[PDB]
Amino acid sequence: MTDKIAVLLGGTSAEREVSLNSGAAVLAGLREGGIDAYPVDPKEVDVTQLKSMGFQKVFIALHGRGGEDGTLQGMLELMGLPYTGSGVMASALSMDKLRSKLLWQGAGLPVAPWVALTRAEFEKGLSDKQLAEISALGLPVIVKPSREGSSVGMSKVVAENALQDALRLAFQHDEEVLIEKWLSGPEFTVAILGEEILPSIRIQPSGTFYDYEAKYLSDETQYFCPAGLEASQEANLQALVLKAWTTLGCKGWGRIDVMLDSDGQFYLLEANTSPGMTSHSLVPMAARQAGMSFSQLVVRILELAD
Numbered sequence: 140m141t142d143k144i145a146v147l148l149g150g151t152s153a154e155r156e157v158s159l160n161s162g163a164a165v166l167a168g169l170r171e172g173g174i175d176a177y178p179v180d181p182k183e184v185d186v187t188q189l190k191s192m193g194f195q196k197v198f199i200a201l202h203g204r205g206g207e208d209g210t211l212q213g214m215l216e217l218m219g220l221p222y223t224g225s226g227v228m229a230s231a232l233s234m235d236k237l238r239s240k241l242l243w244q245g246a247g248l249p250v251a252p253w254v255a256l257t258r259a260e261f262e263k264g265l266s267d268k269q270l271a272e273i274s275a276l277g278l279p280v281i282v283k284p285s286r287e288g289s290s291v292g293m294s295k296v297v298a299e300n301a302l303q304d305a306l307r308l309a310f311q312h313d314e315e316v317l318i319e320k321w322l323s324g325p326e327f328t329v330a331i332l333g334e335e336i337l338p339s340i341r342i343q344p345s346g347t348f349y350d351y352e353a354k355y356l357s358d359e360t361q362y363f364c365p366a367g368l369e370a371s372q373e374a375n376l377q378a379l380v381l382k383a384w385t386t387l388g389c390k391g392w393g394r395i396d397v398m399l400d401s402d403g404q405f406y407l408l409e410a411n412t413s414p415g416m417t418s419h420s421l422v423p424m425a426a427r428q429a430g431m432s433f434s435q436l437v438v439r440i441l442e443l444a445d
């Protein structure tokens with residue numbers, strides 16, 4: 140009461156249905172922890188009248204462009220309403236897998252060899268002396284849109300012969316594209332809550348990459364918590380994820396994706412400042428393992444709102 144909280148779910152991104160799913164969970168979780176939370180889909184109500192509706196705080200359960208970029212966060216800062224995750228800048232920074240990679244590399248963090256392409260570069264026919272670039276990377280490479288989540292628009296390409304199509308796809312999602320080198324090793328994610336970092340997770344998709352379907356609609360993908368890593372490695376991770384996190388300037392809560400490569404090093408893929416919270420999500424998995432309940436987690440996240 141007074142402390143009527145708003146749970147921003149839905150929205151209009153490509154990740155809209157996961158959001159609705161993440162949002163449904165945070166709702167019950169919060170209400171279970173005794174909070175007066177309400178579902179607010181920006182694809183209906185105008186978020187601008189948020190203040191005019193008496194919400195004292197906001198829990199962002201939106202994913203992608205519109206909710207995980209600096210926009211929403213910018214407005215709220217001006218409305219003077221506390222909200223759950225990272226600030227304007229770090230939400231802007233994280234969404235952009237391209238500027239993320241440059242900043243992380245600027246700070247000496249291990250980021251995978253890549254090539255960036257804009258759509259106009261693509262519409263004109265890319266320089267034969269540009270596949271010189273993509274080729275100096277390896278076979279295979281992965282194509283990903285710059286500002287997406289949930290493995291949307293991504294595609295793996297073996298041989299330069301399938302790239303034109305990979306790129307067609309990725310471009311339907313963003314005008315800026317990264318073409319990066321295939322990491323050949325196990326995959327990992329690390330959740331952060333306040334200044335604590337949750338037991339690590341190792342994912343084992345039952346396919347080629349951790350794809351939208353592996354992520355949410357497949358009961359074959361496998362999860363290990365913690366990671367099953369020697370205590371040497373399990374320390375290189377945390378320290379890396381933490382260096383990574385502060386470099387972005389992120390706060391409150393979020394989750395970082397990483398992978399091993401053949402040379403035995405950890406490579407940073409991207410950071411997510413508003414992680415999913417569905418029955419398949421990773422943040423909730425890492426938290427349980429750390430003895431919290433779905434409501435404690437979410438409640439703790441709200442406690443962190445600024």
Ligand SMILES: Nc1ncnc2c1ncn2[C@@H]1O[C@H](COP(=O)(O)OP(=O)(O)O)[C@@H](O)[C@H]1O
Nearest residue numbers: 287288289290291320321322348349396408409
């Ligand atoms: N360099 C890479 N090599 C191999 N697979 C990768 C690479 N980068 C990402 N992937 C796979 O693609 C999935 C999407 O990765 P990620 O970059 O975090 O994007 P998104 O925001 O869509 O989740 C990852 O979880 C991983 O399974």
Ligand SMILES: C[C@@H](C[P@@](=O)(OP(=O)(O)O)[C@@H](C)N)C(=O)O
Nearest residue numbers: 288289290354414415420421422
């Ligand atoms: C699987 C993962 C998804 P997500 O948080 O992260 P990715 O960007 O890698 O899909 C996503 C909502 N953007 C989760 O719900 O735990």
Ligand SMILES: [Mg+2]
Nearest residue numbers: 287288409411
């Ligand atoms: Mg992501």
Ligand SMILES: [Mg+2]
Nearest residue numbers: 289396408409
């Ligand atoms: Mg990911």
